[PDB]
Amino acid sequence: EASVSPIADNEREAVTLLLGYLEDKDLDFYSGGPLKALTTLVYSDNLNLQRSAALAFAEITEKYVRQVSREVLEPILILLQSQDPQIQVAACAALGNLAVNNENKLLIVEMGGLEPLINQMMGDNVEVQCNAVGCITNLATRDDNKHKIATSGALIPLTKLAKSKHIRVQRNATGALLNMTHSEENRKELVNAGAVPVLVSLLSSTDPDVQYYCTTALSNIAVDEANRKKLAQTEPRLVSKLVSLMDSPSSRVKCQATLALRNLASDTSYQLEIVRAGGLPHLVKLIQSDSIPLVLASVACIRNISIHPLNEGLIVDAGFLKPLVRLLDYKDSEEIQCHAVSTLRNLAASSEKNRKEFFESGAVEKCKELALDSPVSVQSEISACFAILALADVSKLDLLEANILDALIPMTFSQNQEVSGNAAAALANLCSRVNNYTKIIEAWDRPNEGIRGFLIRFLKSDYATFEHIALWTILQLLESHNDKVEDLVKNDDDIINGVRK
Amino acid sequence: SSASFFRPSNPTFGTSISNVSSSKALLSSFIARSD
């Protein structure tokens, strides 16, 4: 007995044909004779003949990566379902080879190739896990496939494999999970699949790639309000782990941890918690770094943190004022400059209590210098900060002595309503209820038609708000009880006619 | 509307979207001999 009968006639011919094909040093394996021979073996009930085809597929695809037919992929996807580990390894290697091609990435998923891969990842053979998770990451490079991977049920095996002790497996699993964070729907699927606890624990990973992938994935996840809510509810260790990663020896990891904190800084509770967790000393160092990425991330994150009024005192105490002003020297980075000015405006708007150190920082003079030779977005931030500063009666004269009118008057000429309107409002408040009009009088006809020209121009404006600012400014001057100031208005025919007509 | 003077600034945020011994021997064991 012992299988007295031999191999089938058609399978013997397939064996001989395929061996001859593989021995030839030339040959299209994906179309005719070679493909028919391979398919015959992949249909044999002899396991060794199936191993021969799976091994041949892997060798062929490792040397011939082309766009293939369904007739090439069907036998491979059959072999993926084998109970035989050797057949599974080779067949997955072959599919992984073919999946580096872009068109193959689509046809494989369209044919249900994601099914066999998911189950192989749930198995216990580390080599099949590795080839399957690599084929999965390779398929996910195309955005068309990402959503259906996210809903296929594959995030569960990717989450399990992210906990694997083999670093090849773990890097690929976390890399794949990272690839699923580029859309809100995909981030939602990945959160719903339970991957957040795993990503957070792997922030502690000793491999630099793994902790980079998981830091970047959590940062992307934190971009959605609904995910920040669940993070705050189920991940108490998240902020401390990210703060610790701001000490990473890798600039790449330090940058992504800071970007994650910035995203989680959108919610008031995280703006406080990051401060409570000790984030301020790291950020004040990072904004002084020479690494452009480090500065971009840290200034964006302190800007978000400074939105919270209860953080103003601690931010000033941590010494942010002078380093923030030095950031205005990045005259080629609009993003750095706007974030720095916006941070300073937030601090000025929260409290007047540190206004003295605000002035000693050089912030007013530096903003004055940028006001005219900076982009309009930077102009928008500076003019708004000036408008905020001009509200406090306690610092109005200090602002005027600093010659702030030399910046404000030119800005009222701007074609951008934000710049012009912010500067007009600042000017109006500076004329209100001050007890020294020396600087106002000096600026009457001084830089850019001084104040007189500003009133005449805004009295004519088609914008009802701009006209109102001029009329209200004139009333401030008329109420100054300064004989000279009142005469500047009351003895000016051009201002009188602008008011009347 | 007086509360508009208390409207907090919009937070800045962002994502990072950057993507990231032979079959011959086995076959030869099945080659048949013939005259």
Partner residue facing A175 (CB), from B8, B20, B29 = B20
Q: Cβ of A422 under 8 Å from any chain B Cβ?
A: no
3-state SS class at A3 = coil
Residue A237 phi/psi, 5-degree rounding, is -85, 0
> Which sequence spans correspond to the domains of chain A?
236-361
**Which token pair is A207?**
């491999």
**Which token pair is A308?**
């919270």
* Angle, helix A376-389 to helix A417-430, in steps of 10 degrees: 20
Closest Cα of chain B to A261: distance in Å? Answer: 10
For residues A458 and A468, the answer to whether their CB atoms sit within 8 Å is no
Cα A58 to Cα A159: distance, rounded to the nearest angstrom? 27
Radius of gyration of chain A (CA): 34
Q: What dotted CATH number matches A236-361?
A: 1.25.10.10
Cα A195 to Cα A158: distance, rounded to the nearest angstrom? 8
For residues B12 and A339, the answer to whether their CB atoms sit within 8 Å is yes
Q: Which residues of A touch B20 (CB under 8 A)?
A: 175, 178-179, 213
Query: Could you tell me how far CA A56 lies from the centroid of its own chain?
Result: 44
Partner residue facing A182 (CB), from B11, B17, B29 = B17
**Which token pair is A289?**
């770094």
Q: Which of A15, A339, A344 is the best substitution to test chain B (most B C-beta atoms within 10 A)?
A: A15
**Which token pair is A123?**
């198995």
Amino acid present at A458? F
**Contact flag B11-A304 (C-beta cutoff 8 Å):** yes
Resolution (A): 2.1
Closest Cα of chain B to A474: distance in Å? Answer: 23
DSSP string, B11-28: PP----------HHHHHH
Q: Quick one: which H or E segment has residue A201? A: helix A195-201
Neighbours of A152 (CB within 10 A): 18
Cα A205 to Cα A208: distance, rounded to the nearest angstrom? 7
* Angle, helix A251-263 to helix A279-286, in steps of 10 degrees: 120
Distance (Å) of CA A266 to CA A233, A260, A278, A304, A351: 16, 10, 18, 6, 20
Q: Which residues of A touch B8 (CB under 8 A)?
A: 307
Distance (Å) of CA A340 to CA A302, A307, A335, A395: 9, 13, 9, 21
Residue A497 phi/psi, 5-degree rounding, is -70, -35
Query: Could you tell me how far CA A429 lies from the centroid of its own chain?
Result: 38
Cα A355 to Cα A176: distance, rounded to the nearest angstrom? 49
Number of alpha carbons in the 13 Å side-chain half-sphere of residue A147: 5
Residue bearing tokens 């409002």: A425
The dihedral through the CA atoms of A52, A53, A58, A64 has a sign that is positive
Q: Quick one: which H or E segment has residue A246? A: none
Residue A76 burial class via C-beta count within 10 angstroms: exposed 0-12, middle 13-18, buried 19 and up? buried
Gap positions in chain B, given as the residue before each gap (C–N > 2.5 A)? 20
Q: Cβ of A52 under 8 Å from any chain B Cβ?
A: yes
Structure determination method: X-ray
Amino acid present at A70? R
Q: Cβ of A331 under 8 Å from any chain B Cβ?
A: no
| Among candidate residues A196, A208, A117, the one with its CA nearest the CA of residue A167 | A208
DSSP string, A256-321: HHHHHHHHTTSSHHHHHHHHHTTHHHHHHHHTT-S-HHHHHHHHHHHHHHTTSGGGHHHHHHTT-H
Amino acid present at A9? D
Residue bearing tokens 């401060």: A275
Distance (Å) of CA A244 to CA A204, A210, A238, A240, A257: 9, 16, 10, 6, 9
Residue A475 burial class via C-beta count within 10 angstroms: exposed 0-12, middle 13-18, buried 19 and up? middle
**Contact flag A19-B16 (C-beta cutoff 8 Å):** no
**Contact flag A19-B24 (C-beta cutoff 8 Å):** yes
Residues in contact with A456: Cβ distance below 8 Å, sequence separation at least 6, in sequence order: A449, A494, A495, A498
* Angle, helix A47-63 to helix A85-98, in steps of 10 degrees: 20
**Contact flag B9-A342 (C-beta cutoff 8 Å):** yes
Query: Could you tell me how far CA A440 lies from the centroid of its own chain?
Result: 45
Residues in contact with A3: Cβ distance below 8 Å, sequence separation at least 6, in sequence order: none
3-state SS class at A431 = coil
| Among candidate residues A293, A356, A370, A282, the one with its CA nearest the CA of residue A326 | A370
For chain A, positions 179-218, list CB contacts with chain B under 8 A: 179, 181-182, 213, 216
